[PDB]
Design an enzyme around this catalytic site. Structure first.
Site, short mmCIF file in Angstrom:
data_model
loop_
_atom_site.label_atom_id
_atom_site.label_comp_id
_atom_site.label_asym_id
_atom_site.label_seq_id
_atom_site.Cartn_x
_atom_site.Cartn_y
_atom_site.Cartn_z
N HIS A 105 0.81 -1.21 0.00
CA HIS A 105 0.00 0.00 0.00
C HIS A 105 0.85 1.26 0.00
CE1 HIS A 105 0.02 -0.32 4.58
NE2 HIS A 105 0.47 0.90 4.36
N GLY A 110 3.05 6.06 10.22
CA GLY A 110 4.39 5.85 9.70
C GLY A 110 5.03 4.56 10.17
N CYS A 118 4.00 1.54 9.47
CA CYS A 118 3.82 0.48 8.50
C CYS A 118 5.18 -0.02 8.02
CB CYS A 118 2.97 0.97 7.33
SG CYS A 118 1.29 1.36 7.83
#
EC number: 3.4.19.12
Lengths: 306, 306
Positions: B41, B143, B145
């Site tokens: 993503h 942030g 991820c």
């Protein structure tokens, strides 16, 4: 979202751990630049510990009395001094992995990461607080002596603890990195015991603010309180008195949640007086006191959940 | 002595974290050998997320669409594929710090260390468990991820989790390192919610054994129980049924404490039925389910306190 006992990444510190052997005793040391720091009781035998004279025991040893291993490589010792309850071994090699660092003597209530080591190999990392009674509630087995505690600021490792011993109650005692003990403890075998402890009020309050930032306010109430009035309750429940300084510290957290510090204190006294009624806060069933206000801002969103 | 949520030293993993940017989105990636793994993503815009077609979105990008930074150094991307919900970026440089490693898909109830990262810089490490409902109760902000979960065995890092998203209840969801989600979740914006969770019975029992090894047996009783009888109680309290397999697993811990597994189960049902009566176990006010039996033996003495 979420809230956890978070330790600092331990990489910069793992690179500093070594094994120190003297005679029949092996424990961990800390290798920074060309110096290895370890607990002085590495030079003691079992019966030595009953009443050691470290000055007397150390004069009887030479540089080659010590064996320092870093992984597979033996470092040559070329000097040695005692600094308080620590030994400093000068070695022939500067640690290429030496991080930028300082030595700081932490205050009670403050927290730090512990890297538990055996035979100079890091085995695990966890967060803990320096208790008011100068002990830490750690997790240590035989051979953990020399493990250190630290915080990290930018790229700078602040070493604040070296582990020396366990007390009859299974809590732990050690020194800062100049070899000065936290608390009234000494490095020898005696009947010393932890003094009675108390709950860290500033941390509990910080944690309640954390719960709010994370969208939980069930425990709040419409009341406020006086410093004095709160402290009569604190005494009864073995919490440290709250001081104007602690109220100032909780400023930033008070501002971002819109909850006056003394209002939070009113909530706290209600919780202490009424229990939690089988409910939880941040997933916990009892009040948590091993998060500082600094820890809370570190880990929480700078934006509260609503 | 003592018992703590212990994470594995995070050094071997810190050396693998990088920053991955595509257009306006930046998140963390995992750099092993000449490959960087990250959540797919990273190629989405805010509105993309509402209904992305990753195949369609990715064909529209080239190698130079991605910017990978390791500290201060930009790594050149020279290939890219999608593997399930992950992107693999082939880079022109092999990571000199690549540890020996494997990718494993962890089972529910199992635990691991999480290295929380932002902009490719490790910020903290903590232990957690894969919940029965396939979520983890983590601590993540925007942030995070691309942060990964791992265990360490000897010198071998077992990567088991990569963080992708947070659910409405503030718990977290992600994939193994082949990009297959844990749980029925998908990497796009929808009304998905955590299914109802349950308490990990095997872990709770392990933890009660831990309390005993550490010299505490207050909660014990003279009774024993049937698997079947225990499980009627378990259902009522939203605990997972106990199975013969779980009894076998608790073997070693049962032997070193001399407490028959089903006797421990009798204690557990008493605790669930009678509460803890304002008392604590291992310092906790409610039963703990994020320690496996493996975690207990890892950290506890091989010799019980008496």
């Amino acid at each position: 979202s979420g809230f956890r006992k978070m330790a600092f990444p331990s990489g910069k510190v793992e690179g500093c751990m070594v094994q120190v052997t003297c005679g029949t005793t092996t424990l961990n040391g800390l290798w920074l630049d060309d110096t290895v720091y370890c607990p002085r009781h590495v030079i003691c035998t079992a019966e030595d510990m009953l009443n050691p004279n470290y000055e007397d025991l150390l004069i009887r040893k030479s540089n080659h009395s010590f064996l320092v291993q870093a992984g597979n490589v033996q470092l040559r010792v070329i000097g040695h001094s005692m600094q308080n309850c620590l030994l400093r071994l000068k070695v022939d090699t500067s640690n290429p992995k030496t991080p930028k660092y300082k030595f700081v003597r932490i205050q009670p209530g403050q927290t730090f990461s512990v890297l538990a080591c055996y035979n100079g190999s890091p085995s695990g990392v966890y967060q803990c607080a320096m208790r008011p009674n100068h002990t830490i509630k750690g997790s240590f087995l035989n051979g953990s002596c020399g493990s250190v505690g630290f915080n990290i600021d930018y790229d700078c490792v602040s070493f604040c603890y070296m582990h020396h011993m366990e007390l009859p109650t299974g809590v732990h005692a050690g020194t800062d990195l100049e070899g000065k003990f936290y608390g009234p403890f000494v490095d020898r075998q005696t009947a010393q015991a932890a003094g009675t402890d108390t709950t860290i009020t500033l941390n509990v309050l910080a944690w309640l603010y954390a719960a709010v930032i994370n969208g939980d306010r069930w425990f709040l109430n419409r009341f406020t309180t006086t410093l004095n009035d709160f402290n009569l309750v604190a005494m009864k429940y073995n919490y440290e008195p709250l001081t104007q300084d602690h109220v100032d510290i909780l400023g930033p957290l008070s501002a971002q949640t819109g909850i006056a510090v003394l209002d939070m204190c009113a909530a706290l006294k209600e919780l202490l007086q009424n229990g939690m009624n089988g409910r939880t806060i941040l997933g916990a069933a009892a009040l948590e006191d091993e998060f500082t206000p600094f820890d809370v801002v570190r880990q929480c969103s700078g934006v509260t959940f609503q």
